[PDB]
Design a protein around this motif. Structure first.
Motif, short mmCIF file in Angstrom:
data_model
loop_
_atom_site.label_atom_id
_atom_site.label_comp_id
_atom_site.label_asym_id
_atom_site.label_seq_id
_atom_site.Cartn_x
_atom_site.Cartn_y
_atom_site.Cartn_z
N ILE A 69 3.54 -7.22 -5.08
CA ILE A 69 4.34 -5.86 -4.90
C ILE A 69 3.84 -4.64 -5.03
N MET A 70 2.62 -4.48 -5.78
CA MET A 70 2.13 -3.23 -5.97
C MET A 70 1.11 -3.01 -4.86
N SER A 71 0.49 -4.06 -4.31
CA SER A 71 -0.38 -3.91 -3.26
C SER A 71 0.58 -3.64 -1.85
N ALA A 72 1.83 -4.07 -1.91
CA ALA A 72 2.52 -3.68 -0.65
C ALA A 72 3.21 -2.07 -0.94
N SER A 73 3.22 -1.91 -1.83
CA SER A 73 3.74 -0.30 -2.36
C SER A 73 2.66 0.54 -2.08
N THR A 74 1.33 0.21 -2.24
CA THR A 74 0.28 1.27 -1.91
C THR A 74 -0.70 0.58 -0.75
N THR A 75 -0.06 -0.04 0.37
CA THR A 75 -0.67 -0.34 1.35
C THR A 75 -0.78 0.53 2.39
N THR A 76 0.18 1.69 2.43
CA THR A 76 0.07 2.60 3.37
C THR A 76 -0.82 4.05 2.61
N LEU A 77 -1.13 3.86 1.30
CA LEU A 77 -1.80 4.87 0.86
C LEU A 77 -3.39 4.27 1.00
N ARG A 78 -3.67 3.03 0.81
CA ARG A 78 -4.99 2.20 0.65
C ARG A 78 -5.34 2.25 2.16
N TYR A 79 -4.62 1.61 3.05
CA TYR A 79 -5.11 1.61 4.46
C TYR A 79 -4.30 2.76 5.08
N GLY B 60 -2.13 4.95 7.23
CA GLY B 60 -0.93 5.16 8.20
C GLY B 60 -1.04 6.70 8.39
N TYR B 61 0.06 7.28 8.84
CA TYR B 61 0.03 8.74 9.15
C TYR B 61 1.27 9.26 8.43
N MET B 62 2.22 8.59 7.94
CA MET B 62 3.01 9.15 6.91
C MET B 62 2.95 9.22 5.42
N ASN B 63 3.23 10.35 4.87
CA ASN B 63 3.24 10.45 3.30
C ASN B 63 2.38 9.87 2.60
N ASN B 64 1.01 9.75 2.89
CA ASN B 64 0.13 8.99 2.14
C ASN B 64 -0.25 9.60 0.90
N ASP B 65 0.03 10.69 0.70
CA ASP B 65 -0.14 11.05 -0.66
C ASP B 65 1.19 10.69 -1.62
N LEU B 66 0.87 10.37 -2.93
CA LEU B 66 1.90 9.84 -3.72
C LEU B 66 3.16 10.66 -3.57
N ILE B 67 2.79 12.25 -3.81
CA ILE B 67 4.24 12.98 -3.92
C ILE B 67 5.01 13.14 -2.79
N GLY B 68 4.61 13.05 -1.45
CA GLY B 68 5.52 13.12 -0.35
C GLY B 68 6.20 11.50 -0.26
N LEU B 69 5.37 10.64 -0.78
CA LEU B 69 6.02 9.26 -0.50
C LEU B 69 7.29 9.09 -1.36
N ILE B 70 6.93 9.61 -2.80
CA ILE B 70 8.12 9.34 -3.74
C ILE B 70 8.87 10.48 -3.50
N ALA B 71 8.65 11.34 -2.90
CA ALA B 71 9.47 12.53 -2.58
C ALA B 71 10.79 12.04 -1.76
N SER B 72 10.95 11.10 -0.85
CA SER B 72 11.93 10.58 -0.21
C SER B 72 12.73 9.46 -1.03
N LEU B 73 11.98 8.93 -2.07
CA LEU B 73 12.20 7.74 -2.55
C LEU B 73 13.43 7.93 -3.77
N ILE B 74 13.26 9.27 -4.60
CA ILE B 74 14.33 9.72 -5.50
C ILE B 74 15.13 10.60 -4.90
N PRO B 75 16.45 10.02 -4.73
CA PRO B 75 17.50 11.13 -4.41
C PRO B 75 18.10 11.70 -5.44
N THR B 76 18.25 11.20 -6.58
CA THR B 76 18.86 11.73 -7.75
C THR B 76 17.96 12.03 -8.86
N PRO B 77 17.97 13.33 -9.41
CA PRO B 77 16.69 13.74 -10.16
C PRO B 77 16.46 13.07 -11.38
N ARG B 78 17.72 12.29 -11.83
CA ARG B 78 17.46 11.75 -13.37
C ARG B 78 17.56 10.21 -12.99
#
Lengths: 420, 47
Positions: free
Chosen positions: A221-231, A233-251
């Motif tokens: 699971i952890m390798s799949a979630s960091t696959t686009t960061l380690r290898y 791609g070209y979408m949101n390969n920083d952690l900030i931009g990746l989790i930026a779409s992932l959290i819709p509700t701030p709490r």
């Protein structure tokens, strides 16, 4: 960007060691760190470019009364890492009191590893709630990361103690650590002992050695979630931009994590998306609906099928969400790793916020309250007495998680100008 | 029949082969297929 794994807890150290041997098998590297002859791609997300192309993994090992370091010592993974990063109880309060007195040198360890990296953006935690040594020390480490680093990320890949009602001290510890995770951590990937154990009993024929296969599942699971960061791609390969779409509700930052191969031993993206939205394929345990969905597909994929799959998935109303905004299901693509030793390279992942996790949280909101009324399972430990004389921190945690439940139920509504 | 397209049948087989050799000479030697995904790799933000 670059994140450094802080492993804590017995199962946390197990998934840390399993994660590093998984990344050693995944990348073309030796168990000393030397580049191989079958390995340009990026190897700078978890590995420093050290001396002889030694991709030394950046990690922090924390525990109390050491057990697993002996298994590290008699292995070739004491020759892959440890240039000096390894630091040597049973309750949240004992762990909190033990972490209070040695906060200086563990903060020095955090500073040393932050100086070791070249671009600090977040501190990822491989942790187990109520693993023994992880409880209390992990929450105090979260408080230290929130106080010292408000400008960086805190990521928690964690399993949460559910036995379907075993241990009678873990609901107090998990609720207090959950309150610390709400106030002092920036994103939580939630996993459960019953969900992983049930799927392990389904796909295999085991029931007693749950830990060794939970290590494999969490590492995949952890390798799949960091696959686009380690290898790359070209979408949101920083952690900030990746989790930026992932959290819709701030709490509400607790994310569902599914995985379309339960065992990795053809298919279209439509079928694995229909699979992946079902909760039986998800390793996470009335009106419940998502707020925002995102999925990442990596394999031998045709991109026009990603088109038609997204079209049919959102129109046939299997993406179930009633938000207070337009927040929706999102597609994402990744490149499958060159030189995986694993076969069957088509794999899917989902990172979505669902309100159904609130019901599982409500079980913990039951359990502590039930164990507060019987009063033989708070156990009256003296470390809990010196933590707080009035024992109102547990009531504060119950209030915070009650606000969390009301915020899930308000996010089901089309209004978030009112939560309870 | 009377036409100049009966003459071209043993000749256009060589002309078309020369054209196919030109396009294959682009691809497998001048790497024209790699150039598309190289200019893509910077101009629609694929890095």
């Amino acid at each position: 960007r670059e994140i450094i794994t802080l492993q804590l807890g017995q199962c946390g150290n197990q998934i840390g060691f399993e994660f590093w041997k998984q990344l050693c098998a995944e990348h073309g590297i030796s168990p000393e760190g030397i580049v191989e002859e079958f390995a340009t791609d990026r190897k700078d997300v978890f590995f420093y470019q050290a001396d002889d192309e030694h991709y030394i993994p950046r990690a922090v090992l924390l525990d109390l009364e050491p057990r697993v370091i002996h298994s590290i010592l008699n292995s070739p993974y004491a020759k892959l890492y440890n240039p000096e990063n390894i630091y040597l109880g049973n309750n949240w309060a004992s762990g909190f009191s033990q972490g209070e007195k040695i906060h200086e040198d563990i903060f020095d360890i955090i500073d040393r590893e932050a100086d070791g990296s070249d671009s600090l953006e977040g501190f990822v935690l491989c942790h187990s709630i109520a693993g023994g040594t992880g409880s209390g020390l992990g929450s105090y480490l979260l408080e230290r990361l929130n106080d010292r680093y408000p400008k960086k990320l805190v990521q928690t890949y964690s399993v949460f103690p559910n036995q379907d009602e075993d241990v009678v001290v873990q609901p107090y510890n998990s609720l207090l650590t959950l309150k610390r995770l709400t106030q002092n951590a920036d994103c939580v990937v939630v996993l459960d002992n019953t969900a992983l154990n049930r799927i392990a009993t389904d796909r295999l024929h085991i029931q007693n050695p749950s830990f060794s296969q939970i290590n494999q599942l969490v590492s995949t699971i952890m390798s799949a979630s960091t696959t686009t960061l380690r290898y790359p791609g070209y979408m949101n390969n920083d952690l900030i931009g990746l989790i930026a779409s992932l959290i819709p509700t701030p709490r509400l930052h607790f994310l569902m994590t599914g995985y379309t191969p339960l065992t990795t031993d053809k298919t279209t993206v439509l079928d694995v998306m229909r699979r992946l939205l079902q909760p039986k394929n998800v390793m996470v345990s009335t009106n419940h609906c998502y707020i925002a969905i995102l999925n990442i597909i990596q394999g031998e994929v045709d991109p026009t099928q990603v088109h038609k799959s997204l079209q049919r998935i959102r129109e046939r109303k299997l993406a179930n969400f009633i938000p207070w905004g337009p927040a929706s299901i999102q597609v994402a693509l990744s490149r499958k790793s060159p030189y995986l030793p694993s076969a069957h390279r088509v794999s899917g992942l989902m990172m979505a916020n669902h309100t159904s996790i609130s019901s599982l949280f409500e079980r913990t909101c039951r359990q502590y309250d039930k164990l507060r009324k019987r009063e033989a399972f708070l156990e009256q430990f003296r470390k809990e007495d010196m933590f707080k004389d009035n024992f109102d921190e547990m009531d504060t945690s119950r209030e915070i998680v009650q606000q969390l439940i009301d915020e899930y139920h308000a996010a089901t509504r089309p209004d978030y100008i009112s939560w309870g | 029949v009377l036409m100049k397209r009966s003459i071209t049948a043993p000749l256009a087989a060589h002309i078309s082969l020369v054209n196919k050799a030109a396009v294959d000479y682009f691809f497998v030697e001048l790497h024209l297929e790699a150039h598309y995904e190289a200019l893509r790799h910077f101009l629609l933000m694929e890095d």
